[PDB]
Amino acid sequence: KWDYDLRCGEYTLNLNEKTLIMGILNVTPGSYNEVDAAVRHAKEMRDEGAHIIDIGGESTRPGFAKVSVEEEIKRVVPMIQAVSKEVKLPISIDTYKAEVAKQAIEAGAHIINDIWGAKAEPKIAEVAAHYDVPIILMHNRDNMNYRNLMADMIADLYDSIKIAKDAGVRDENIILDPGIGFAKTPEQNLEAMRNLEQLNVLGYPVLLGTSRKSFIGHVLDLPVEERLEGTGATVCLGIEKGCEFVRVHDVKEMSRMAKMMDAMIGK
Amino acid sequence: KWDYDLRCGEYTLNLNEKTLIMGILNVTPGSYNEVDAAVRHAKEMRDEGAHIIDIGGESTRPGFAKVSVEEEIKRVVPMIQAVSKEVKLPISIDTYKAEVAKQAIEAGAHIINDIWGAKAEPKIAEVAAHYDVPIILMHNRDNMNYRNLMADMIADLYDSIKIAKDAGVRDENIILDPGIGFAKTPEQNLEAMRNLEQLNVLGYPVLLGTSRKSFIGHVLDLPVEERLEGTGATVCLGIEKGCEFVRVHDVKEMSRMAKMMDAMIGK
Ligand SMILES: Nc1nc2c(c(=O)[nH]1)N=C(CNc1ccc(S(=O)(=O)Nc3nccs3)cc1)CN2
Ligand SMILES: Nc1nc2c(c(=O)[nH]1)N=C(CNc1ccc(S(=O)(=O)Nc3nccs3)cc1)CN2
């Protein structure tokens, strides 16, 4: 179906063979204890079937505390250098800032993961263009007053493509994400899942990030630690509705579900 | 969507509100220890969200040892009487025999579950007609030489409807089952899952039975006890492709997945 592979640097990721698992790595206090914990977690997630490792923090997570520019660098960079050498998998850096994104690739990160899809700092997309690296553009907005959810999401996403393409970003580096849990009531979150196949008309791979999110909590009436089964249902629907990547905490469980989905749907 | 509820005796099961969980109860050695274990398991499965309890044995499970007529009765009947009184849920009896099926309802069973869809003993469908009780007709055959899997399954299933309807069985008591793991290579099992939505044109509710089955094992390369995630993927696809009931061992986990699927698909 996809006439190209996802080329990054040392590793080639094939989009037709299977659903790609992206394992989540949270980094919230460069001491030994934090960098070692992060490495051990990545090894674990590698051993359980992760294809990409995702490295972010306290900005970009509810709270959304606007922590400092130089601060993000000294936290995330040692993390990348260590994971890159010990763990033979591509890495994405979860940031909405060009400045940070910049260091991250130079320290060895491969994919950019922007929860603001270049609207925070359009300069990020120039960084993307220049090192020639896949960039994930997530739907997000600073309000959530939709005329029409899906139509507005596709419009918003397209506003992101436009920023990337104009920067020089080649199509084959774009990847989109419906931004589950961002600027969306819990009902809107469900609608987006129900209509996920609409993002496919845009012609770019899609990544889904629903792991343990609160709309799962809203439905099941369950706290974060009991959300594994409900995360599973969201990963299955997503694969069936055409997603290429899933971002998850529970690499082991999700990896089995994805591999059974792939076999059933014919991937 | 369904203009009727599933009427049985004391309990009414609604087909539009949610996916119905049918919990599996295996009974393979009327001593106290077996009947007490069976009751405790049913209470557990009730507490975890089961809507129906399913009571069968060594016939109807690989092995398929052709154990005795009077033998099935004295094993399964005490089981039903006890579960019926302690546990306020409808019960199905997993048998392919009229004789047995007969006792089962009289002892308090509500639904008939025939893995041979009335082709073993067409007389079973007369039992169904007479007590006015939902009957599940599963696809099965004594060979597995398909001209065309789905077309043959729909033809075979229709051969079962014909036997039931002629007996007097009202449409609103029929329920069909694609018979996953029966007379089907593991690849055929996957195809059937991939095309499950085709059974819907027949106009009857569908029940899916894929729990921990070996085609899940074939894909994941995993023994029976590590098949929970892969069972989950099959339950999710099934719900999305329109099934009304799922037959499962892990009532807790599946129940959460089904409830998250229901919310996403709009059920
Ligand atoms: N590509 C991509 N990257 C991501 C994504 C994502 O979905 N896609 N999500 C987060 C995590 N942010 C997040 C976590 C939980 C929720 S929530 O729905 O559960 N809401 C709340 N969580 C805690 C308090 S309120 C919302 C956003 C970080 N990076
Ligand atoms: N309505 C309905 N009723 C049922 C069903 C069913 O699917 N639907 N399945 C069984 C269980 N039979 C079964 C269990 C496992 C497999 S298998 O695919 O895993 N094969 C084998 N299992 C063990 C050795 S070979 C096949 C059939 C009993 N009753």
- Report yes or no: A224 at the B interface, CB cutoff 8 Å: no
- From the list A50, A79, A59, the residue with the least C-alpha distance to A246 is A50
- Give the separation between CA B205 and CA B184, rounded to whole angstroms: 22
Q: Is A115 a pocket residue for ligand 1 (Cβ < 6 Å)?
A: yes
CA of A213 to the centre of ligand 1 (A): 6
- Report yes or no: A263 at the B interface, CB cutoff 8 Å: yes
CA of B181 to the centre of ligand 2 (A): 6
Q: Is A137 helix (H, G, I), strand (E, B) or coil?
A: strand
- For residue A18, which residues of chain B lie inside 8 Å, CB to CB? none
- Give the separation between CA B178 and CA B242, rounded to whole angstroms: 12
CA of A103 to the centre of ligand 1 (A): 23
Q: Which runs of E-coded beta strand occur in B27-115? A: 52-56, 91-94, 111-114
Q: Is B61 a pocket residue for ligand 2 (Cβ < 6 Å)?
A: yes
Annotated active-site residue in B213, B227, B241, B267: B213
Among B21, B26, B28, B60, which is best to mutate for testing ligand 2, by the most ligand atoms less than 8 A from CB?
Answer: B60
Determination approach: X-ray
- Give the separation between CA B259 and CA A219, rounded to whole angstroms: 8
Q: Kindly state the tokens that stand for A236.
A: 């299955």
| Pair type for strands A111-114 and A174-177 | unpaired
Q: Is the dihedral of CA A258, A92, A216, A203 positive or negative?
A: negative
Between A and B, how many residue pairs show a Cβ–Cβ distance under 8 A? 91
Q: Is A30 a pocket residue for ligand 1 (Cβ < 6 Å)?
A: no
- Report yes or no: B197 at the A interface, CB cutoff 8 Å: no
Q: Is B113 a pocket residue for ligand 2 (Cβ < 6 Å)?
A: yes
Token pair 């996809």 is at which residue? A2
B235: nearest CA partner in chain A: A233
Q: Is A25 a pocket residue for ligand 1 (Cβ < 6 Å)?
A: no
Under 8 Å between Cβ of B60 and B115: yes
- Give the separation between CA B132 and CA A158, rounded to whole angstroms: 57
Resolution in A: 2.3
Q: Kindly state the tokens that stand for A78.
A: 């040692």
Q: Is A121 helix (H, G, I), strand (E, B) or coil?
A: coil
Q: Kindly state the tokens that stand for B105.
A: 């309802």
- For residue A258, which residues of chain B lie inside 8 Å, CB to CB? 233
Q: Kindly state the tokens that stand for A251.
A: 């690499």
**A243-259: buried (b, 16+ CB within 10 Å) or exposed (e) per residue?**
bbbbbbbbbbbbbbbbb
Q: Is the dihedral of CA A30, A31, A37, A43 positive or negative?
A: positive
Contact at CB, B229 and A232, closer than 8 angstroms:
yes
- Report yes or no: B246 at the A interface, CB cutoff 8 Å: no
Under 8 Å between Cβ of B13 and B264: no
Active site residue B213: yes
Under 8 Å between Cβ of B193 and B237: yes
Contact at CB, B219 and A257, closer than 8 angstroms:
no
Residues forming beta bridges with residue A177, ordered by sequence position: A138
Under 8 Å between Cβ of B117 and B124: no
- Report yes or no: A211 at the B interface, CB cutoff 8 Å: no
B227: nearest CA partner in chain A: A256
CA of B212 to the centre of ligand 2 (A): 9
Contact at CB, B190 and A263, closer than 8 angstroms:
yes
- Give the separation between CA B166 and CA B118, rounded to whole angstroms: 12
Quickly count: other Cβ atoms within 10 Å of residue A20's Cβ.
21
CA of B182 to the centre of ligand 2 (A): 7
**Domains of chain A in sequence order:** 1-267 (3.20.20.20)
- Report yes or no: A246 at the B interface, CB cutoff 8 Å: no
Whole-Å CA distances, B188 to A214, B155, B191: 38, 16, 5
